[PDB]
């Protein structure tokens, strides 16, 4: 596995990722619905500009982006459901930290993948998703009542 | 077909699109790159906010969206396609014309529906789309060289 | 009834609503209060905001708004209470809900009035309205784990 | 008259108006000149953009926009006179105030238009200029101490 | 009396204010009418900030604010009427200044009180307020012709 | 021909130019379409302000602005011509190249008049507008593909 | 009279005037009082920057500005009074308008005298100035009732 | 104890705050977090402002204010334990309320301190500060559902 | 002296010192010139907001503000000197100081005279610009090597 | 070494800001106002590469040059005088080519940096060439061609 | 040591080094004082700001930040002294380079540790705010006289 | 005549930013971080004078240098490499120095338009002027001395 694949995949799974935030925006009831509805807007955002950048990246090095509801799908590691059974905020809270430590992980394969390539670049690139990346999953893990690492 | 179902069918259309604007965005070239780049990234802003809009509507009355690419692939009418062989901008631009016309037809049967079901709101709400995607057939088919209903 | 005592009646009724959201404001406690409290400011802004509409509609078709509390308390079918007994956060958010709920199927009215006499600016007036205070009903009872219109 | 033939009409009533306006501005005295100067400043920048408007419109309906002063003078029914003796700030705001109402009531015609030719844009966006025109007909009426509709 | 009752009995006076505020708002006419529309936006917000701030500090030092229209229609000393025979400007200016001198003696006897009872905090919040409020007083009465505390 | 009648005879040349800059933004097509059409934006409020400019400036030095259309077509000596026949991109920039040498040509005769006169603040802000033609028809002849003084 | 002096005597007459402006800015009393007090306000920075910038001028070509209240008196030829008998509104805004073409007249000959001089820059600053001293007689003698050269 | 030396402590003792309110910032957990996380970066914000005014009016006054953590923690009343067993956000918060007390109290203190010794500005200031504190502690002890003085 | 007389006296005051300000803003020279003359032009406006915040509270008492240079020049007791000898930006600044701290301690008789005469809103303006004046001294006195009551 | 290295690419800098000028200045087409923004956007770009290079030159103890002539003597970008205008086409070219050429030259920054353990120019290094990359990637999509191309 | 120490090790160096900054910022004097008295202002934000990300950081790693100033004081190793002894402005610009280098060269050692241990994000955290510290010390030591690595 | 003059102006903007740089990046002393600031300023209004020059001379049918060997060819002010950064007070000696060389040169050019009939060149020299004289007097001031001295 290259470095083009490695970045086209994560067109993919942040895509699929998304959507998941849209999914987890939409369908959230509980007390905290206020603060965490607008913090999926926050985190849709973000993301998606780290889609848009991985995209630009993987056409900078001469690769060609996933660009398909159809590609995204069939490419993705991320995993998603359609939302039939009511869940609660902790279960969907739990369903996004799943989903950026799925994220964190193989994005510290792209960094060692893109180091060993020689990739100056995009290991930069990855390295700071990953810091964010992170970054969230300490903060959600705390709404949890969880360590960042539990 | 209901609101509820119309609803859910634009969010369909509205993610396969707005992925379709993201491929003309990122596959683009010719003369007119940079103008069609950023007008391209202003069309996902804009209705990627429309699609937050119906989600929002369709939770307002009591539906429930799709959420899932698997679920956007199985409803959407608009198409689309990977991009393998290389398109023209007037190519790309004459898809883009074409998912337009086909919004603003199914927004106008929206339109139709939700007047007769008396829900004004979301009649309110699918005009001022129409308007804005009205707008935009005039604008790229004078890109295009062509009258709008041309 | 017409569409002045309709607009009218409204101007009542939103006074006695902004009071009331400056009653949750100021008797609220939990463990939600600085995002509901910020929320009740923004709440009283909007609403603000929709009584001086109102007014300024109902004086550009001819008509009079009350202005004194004496009269909104005379015409408002708002009901208000006074703050003796201490009411939790999901107490308070069930009355503003309810209130909600109240000047959404007036407001329901008011379109099918305004519709009927031919007053095409105070119906798309009431329409956005109607807008928002369905996103707002969908927003709180979510807040509540319930659905809208539930 | 068709939606298409109205909406030019309304391009050569706007160009008349906004001209007019400049007239206002211009020549105005009296005590209330710092204010209403600013006023009519605001009011060419409004009355502009509901002329832009109006056009692009037009345009997004297959029509064909006048666009030379020689087409707005022949078809606008917006009536002009050279400032020659000078007018008191009442007799100029009377005049704004008359063609205010003029607009008002061609709007009127041309709402009911788009509703049976069953133009829901164009019927959207004259309500919403509309509702702008009551507005500023009560506003203005009120400067000269008589009510909206007296 | 202590500071308690006060500062409720100024959060009746400043709703039945704002009420008055509205009231001159909507009902103003004459040749000063787009400066002193404006102005009524300004005084309803500062006096909403003021009703605000001192239902906080009422708040604060354990009190329990007024918070519906009967309480404050029971306990402001602030006078309204409905309006029923049209007004000049210069009549609603001089009800306007005549419930400006009303809070300013109010808060000079709350200044006095607070600074008895060893409120500090109190006691300078009624003093910045009532310094706006002789700003207010004198810009005011200056409109009318007439030197400030004549 | 005297200071005040050139300024007036602006004031219709600009009113002209600037409906004909609306001619060009509505009816253009082609490649060039969003750049353009947001630039005759531009050029629109930028010419739009000059003439306001200009009649204030007429108003200063005791003059009297034209302030009808009737007035702007019997002394401008800007031309214009109903769209008809279709036009090209390059064919409605080289009338507008062409009318904006023809302005600064004017203004040039302008500029010596009042240099004449001894009129040093009309002078000076008809230096700064030619200033601003001059860089305006560079811009646009380059567009043109031609020298700035061919 | 040279380039220096000239400079130097306007820096005592703006100073003077400034006061002036502060003057009228407190004891205006009427019902444009506040339109015209925010003015004054406007005018007294203006003219403030006016005074700074001809200080800064003469700095620059090796003068020596005066710089006490002493010197603006002793050599100012703009006049002062101190408000004894209360004035209209209209003698205030005379006595504007009186000094305003004092300083027209007199940067009038600043730009001859500069002129003559070779001060291009001195003479373009007096130019500017006049031109905004021009526009304010226009618009205060228009709130006068009387033409700009009346 | 003079003026001087409870600035001092009160630099001490703000130092010791803001230390605090990181502590919390960094170590709380449970459904609150993000709501509760950005609230301590606000009190971290204006406490730091507090130190800062404090620290520099007691350099106005000729003092010298502590400026090593040896001298905050040698010289602050204030008391802080380092984090080991996790706690929940109740008993943060707890903590929080206790040091907003503390300093509620010794505010108070030095309020009636710096009125004896005749210090006005140090007085105002304090007053201030304590205006910010009790508005805090009512609202934190709202969000643990009790009364300000409960 | 009482609360009006004291008030004027600093109007007069705080011209001299605004005119004074802008003396050394224009002759200072020396290394620290660019610091020193942006910090001068930052002291001219605040203390030509502290000379209108004084006039205005002057006025809104009932008084008459001096509002001409003679006036300032006769009651003032800030002493103003001509640029006549050439002084080091370390003596402008001792000028400054001194200014700054005779007004400082006028304020502070300022302050005992209105809180004597029960003045408690002059009390409270007075308070923060000496709070204001404070902190210039301490700063100033730290430019020049000296602690502030030094 | 890292020092010599940076200097040149101040050079590099100078050189390529004054000719980004030239194409703001000398384009014509039927995308002029377009690139000519663009260009002014480039000149900002770069022109902040060029100060944060030599504030870093400064910090790690260099002296940058700081004269055209040195620029001049020193720069591997190449410019040529217009007499002259040329298309569009050809201006985004030359525009491509030196950006290539200030691509590998930073690569081989990076590859240098990292071998003297500069950790942070090697991190400004990498930076910059991100933004190079992306405009590699824009431009020549402009001129309808791959960017690897 | 690990990454976990280090970076808690330099909380606790950030907090000894803020307050220094602060101990700088009050007690200097001399000529320099304005601009670094703002100076300070702004690196004590900055260097909040470090603190700040590195604890953030420490936690997203699984650590837990010190957070008490006896945690601080024990284990920072920047060098702290109570202000006694009068500075010269160059010797506490000498401190601060000085404290400048020491946390330079201790993040030179957590750059190479956080590269052996294989934390990429760490890694580049460290060798943003390196890049800062350097730029700094170039600052620094040129307002100094001094080369950088001097 | 007037293009020769812009042409020339030009070349000497790009000198003078170019030395505006130097001056940014070799200053110490006590007033480093106020006249470093300083800097960034006027290299941002020369960087526009240049900018404005060269779209006048198009705009008047020219064609300007727009290479560092045209600059450095025609430029009437004077660049040294520093080796070397020399104290505070000497730069700012320099920087004041080709302040009042712009001054005179613009003086001659506004002579020179204002005969030629040019008066929008005219009047955009007058307004440079405006501000170098102002640069001048300030840092005159800065100096110790009165602005003509």
Known sequence: ??????????????????????????????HNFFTL???????????GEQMDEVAERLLAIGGSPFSTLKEFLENASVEEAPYTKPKTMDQLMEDLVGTLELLRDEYKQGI???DKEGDDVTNDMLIAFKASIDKHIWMFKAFLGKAPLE
Not at 2 to 30: P, S
Not at 37 to 47: G, P, R, T
Request: aromatic letters at 14%.
């Open 1 to 30: 596995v290259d470095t083009k694949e490695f970045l086209n995949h994560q067109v993919a799974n942040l895509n699929v990722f998304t959507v998941k935030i849209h999914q987890i925006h939409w369908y959230m009831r509980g």
């Open 37 to 47: 509805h607008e913090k999926m807007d926050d985190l849709y955002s973000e993301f």
């Open 112 to 114: 060692e993948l893109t």
